[PDB]
Amino acid sequence: GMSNKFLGTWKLVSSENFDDYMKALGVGLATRKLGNLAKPTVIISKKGDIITIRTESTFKNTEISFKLGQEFEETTADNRKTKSIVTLQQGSLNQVQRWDGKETTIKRKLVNGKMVAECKMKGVVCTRIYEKV
Ligand SMILES: CCCCCCCCCCCCCCCC(=O)O
C-alpha cells in the first residue's frame, strides 16, 4: 500500500513550469498570476483505507479523500469537475484527472525525504517539490 512516509504535513519549496501547466489546463490569466504566488501546504493522512490529500493556500483550499484504484468525483483548485483515480506504481502515488475529453496526471513520489509532484498536461512537465514540516 501507500508508504507511511507520504503521511504528514508538506510545504512547497520549489515550483518549475507551473504557469505553463496551468495554461495547458485552461486556467485564465488572473488565476494563473495568483496560482504562481501560492505556497501551499499539503497534508496527507489516512483513516483505514481512505487517504486524504488536503491542500491549503491563501487563494484556494482543496481536499480529496479516496481509496486506491476507485474512481471519484473531484473538484480541482481551478474548479474543474473531474473523474479522478489514484493508483500506486512502484511506490509512486499517481493521480489521473479526466474531464471534457481531456486528461492530466499528477505523480507524487518521495525523493531524499522530499515529496515531488510531477504534473503533466499537453507535454508540459511541471515539478513541485515539498519538504516535510
Ligand atoms: C491550490 C494550490 C494552487 C493554487 C492555484 C489554483 C489554480 C490552478 C491549480 C490547478 C492545479 C493544481 C495542481 C497542484 C499539484 C500539487 O499538489 O503540487
Ligand SMILES: [Cl-]
Ligand atoms: Cl499561500
